[PDB]
Every structure is written in C-alpha cells, then in structure tokens.
Amino acid sequence: AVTGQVDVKLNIST
Amino acid sequence: AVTGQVDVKLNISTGCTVGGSQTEGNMNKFGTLNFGKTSGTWNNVLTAEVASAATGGNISVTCDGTDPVDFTVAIDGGERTDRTLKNTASADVVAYNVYRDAARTNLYVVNQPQQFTTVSGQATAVPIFGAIAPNTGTPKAQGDYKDTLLVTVNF
Amino acid sequence: AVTGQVDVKLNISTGCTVGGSQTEGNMNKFGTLNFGKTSGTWNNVLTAEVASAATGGNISVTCDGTDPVDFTVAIDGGERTDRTLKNTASADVVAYNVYRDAARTNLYVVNQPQQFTTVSGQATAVPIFGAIAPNTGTPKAQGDYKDTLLVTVNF
Amino acid sequence: GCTVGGSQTEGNMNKFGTLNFGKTSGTWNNVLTAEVASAATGGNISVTCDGTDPVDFTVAIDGGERTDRTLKNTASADVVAYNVYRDAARTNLYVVNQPQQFTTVSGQATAVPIFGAIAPNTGTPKAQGDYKDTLLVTVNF
C-alpha cells in the first residue's frame, strides 16, 4: 500500500 | 476510557514499488495536475496530465517480482471528497475529475481500485488524466485554486 | 506482605462510545494498519490507513450526548514502546509512526491525548494514518512484521 | 525485603491506585477498558526490591468488596461485573486470591500492570450514578 499525493492546480486570472 | 487494539502489519518479501515520487516529509509526493492559467469563464474543457514530482513525466510504477504482477490504482475524492479545487482565499470551488485513458472516458471512480498490469523489468506508467467541465456560467473569482488528491497504489 | 487498595470506578450517566470495533475476547479490536507487501529495501514511504475490524473503513466514534462532546484520542508506542514492527521469527525491526492528518504531519505523539470533537447524531471518524520511512539501507529479512498498537479513546 | 512504589498511605491502608473506566451510558456495546493509575505518581504501580540478586515476588488481587468483582452503585443496588487482567490483551487474568508470579532486578522499577476490562452491556441499562469497588491488591512474597 503506497499512498501518495497529487497536487491539483488551476490559476483563474487572465 | 475505551482502549482497543490496532494490529499493524507489513509483509517484507517481494513487493511492488512506485517510481516518480518524492518524499515530502513523511508523505509521498506523487505529482502535480496542472491545468494552467484560465479566465473566469472557459468554454473549452480544461485538460492536463499529471506530472511526476521526481522526473516531470508520468508516475512510473515498477514491480520487483519476476512474474507479471497485477497491481491496482485508486484515487480518492480530494480534500473535500467531491473533487473540487478550492480558492486559496475565497470559498469558490472548481469541480474536476481524473480519468485513466487519454480520451477522458475511463474515470478513476472515487475509492475504486482501477486494475493495472506490470511485467518484470519495465516501467508501467500510471496515466492520471485530469479534465474540467466547461464553465460557461458564472465567472469564478480570481486567484489560485488547489486540491490534493491522494493516489493509493494498493495491491 | 504489602496489601493495598485499588479503587475501581465507572460513571454510568451519558458517555461516549467507539464504533468500528469488534470484541476480541475481552479486548476491543479496533482495526488493522496494513502497509501491504514490500521488498527488502523500499525507496518510497510505505503508507496505509487503519481499517476498522467491524466495517472495513475508519473507526467511527459517536457520542451519546445531545451537546457537542470533546473527546480525546491517544495511541501508545506498540508492543516494544518505540513503534517498531517485529518479524514473527527473526529479531529484525521496522520503525513506523501513526499520524492524524492525511499529509503525515500531525503525529499521534505516544501517550498523548490528541483532541477531537463530536456532534449529536454523527460518526466522527478517527483517522489513524500510518507511515513508514524509506528503507534504502539494509534489506530487512523476509517474512511478516507485526505490532499491536493500543488506541486509547479516553475522555 | 521488597517494597512497592506508587502507593500513598491512606490513613493506615496503602492506597495503590485507581481503575477508572470513565463515563459511559446505560448500555455500552464496546468492552469498557482502563488501566490502573497509581495514586502517588499517576502511572503504573512500580514495585522495586531492595536485594542485589533478582527476587521473584508475587502479586495477588482479591474479588472486591463483594468478592465477585462487581462495582456497586453508590445509591441503588445495581451491580457492574468486571475483571482485572495482567497483560495488555486481556488474556492473562488475575485469578481471585492467586499469586500471579513476577520478577524484579536490582535497581529497577518493575511495573505491575493491572488492566481492567468490562464486558459489553447490550442487555439492561444499569441505573444512572457512580459505580465503585475497592480491590485489595496483595503484593506478597
């Protein structure tokens, strides 16, 4: 069991 | 005072390992799903692929067995359990989803073991394809939207 | 001959109860922290969550009071008091730790009451997130490694 | 001889500690479980011996005020059956009036784990109030 993290991103600007 | 027991276990024998990750303190950092920049209302489906934090390409799981091993992949629902990115300052949310195939059809259903195969001496990539629905309604507030999906390579 | 007294007490009135446990004989069996299979030397932090023995998900503590009750959670150091899993046959040990938050930051310090809140008519889950450091040094011997952490839901 | 630490002299009777199960409702489904807290320091009873060679001392606990290990409500006559075990997994029971063996080395504190355990009460709701008992622990040689 290898659980990790996946950072999700979105820059709502222009 | 209700005291109970929690049995801890680990089978050190011939397991499978996940490459492409970096150890962020005590939690594996698998990668980033960077949709990029966008305006308030986007008509096109915003779409980006996971970038492994260690090498910049896809997560490359390899197994240590000689025979083909069938390992599973499960992704959770994010910080709020409904796959929504949240603005760092305001309370605006941006609904998204992660799919397994390049055509956004085979969805990584929340807390589900999407099956996978791996041969001896190879790197089977784990495609985590992100996808966001068109936002032709309200313009979400300016700023940075984030989420931390926990990917669970389990056997 | 030194005989003394041990006062026994129990306040039956409006207490708090812990769900997700099974009564193993005369000791509550709260769950299992299953890291899974692994090889001698693992480069990725091995990480798994507690699975309640009664329902397979997280331990779901509920209180019987109408007002919010603030209950605490304390986990001990395991069989050898230093959080090490021991091989069933050999004397090899595998150091580990249990954290409270999904990002492996808020550690359940040994014999410490990590605070918790619970509202009337709800199941507040007790996340016991396990984490093991990368073993890029010596390959620990083959077999099964175990430990029995005693979780202490106390008020 | 050998001496028992962690106790306080309550008048003329050693006060070894408290087995505090905590608060609970009428009917509890989970086994209520708590450890003895020494009255002097708040942790376990720490027996030490004064000999240079290892001494083998015994520990015996009796059946409580009513000799059947039942806590009694201070006001009503309701009873709550319980038991004290020696190991953390509630298996090695401190049988009534029995010398459960123990070892102690020179210059160390061998703790006496008195692990309490109460069976699930999924039948009748016992009346509200405080239930008590006074187990007499007998460190004898």
Numbering used by the authors:
A (entry chain D): 1 to 14
B (entry chain C), C (entry chain B): 1 to 155
D (entry chain A): 15 to 155
What text does the study give?
Adhesive pili assembled through the chaperone–usher pathway are hair-like appendages that mediate host tissue colonization and biofilm formation of Gram-negative bacteria. The formation of this biofilm is mediated by Csu pili assembled through the archaic chaperone–usher CsuC–CsuD pathway. The Csu pilus comprises the major subunit CsuA/B that forms the pilus rod, adaptor subunits CsuA and CsuB, and the two-domain tip adhesin CsuE that binds to various substrates using exposed hydrophobic finger-like loops. The rod-forming CsuA/B subunit deviates from the standard Ig-fold and adopts an unusual architecture featuring two prominent hairpins A′–A″ and B–B′ protruding from the β-sheet.
Here, we present the cryo-electron microscopy structure of the prototypical archaic Csu pilus that mediates biofilm formation of Acinetobacter baumannii—a notorious multidrug-resistant nosocomial pathogen. The structure of the Csu pilus rod was determined to an overall resolution of 3.4 Å. The Csu pilus is a thin (around 23 Å) left-handed filament with a helical rise (z) of 28.0 Å and rotation between subunits (φ) of −153°. Pilins are tilted around 60° relative to the helical axis and about 69° relative to each other, resulting in a zigzag appearance of pili when viewed in sideways projection. In contrast to their classical counterparts, the subunits in Csu rods are linked together not by one, but by two binding mechanisms. First, the incoming CsuA/BN+1 pilin subunit inserts its donor strand GdN+1 into the hydrophobic groove of the preceding CsuA/BN subunit. In the pilus, CsuA/BN+1 not only provides GdN+1 to CsuA/BN, but also inserts its A′–A′′ hairpin into a pocket in CsuA/BN between β-strands B and E2 and loop D–D′. Moreover, the GdN+2 of the third subunit CsuA/BN+2 that complements CsuA/BN+1 binds through its protruding N-terminal part to β-strands A′′ and B in CsuA/BN. Finally, residues in β-strand A and loop A–A′ in CsuA/BN+1 form several contacts with residues in the A′′–B loop at the bottom of CsuA/BN, thereby bridging the two main binding sites to form a continuous binding surface of 600 Å2 with 41 interacting residues and 13 hydrogen bonds. Thus, the clinch contact confers pilus rigidity and determines the trajectory of subunit movement during clinch formation or pilus stretching.
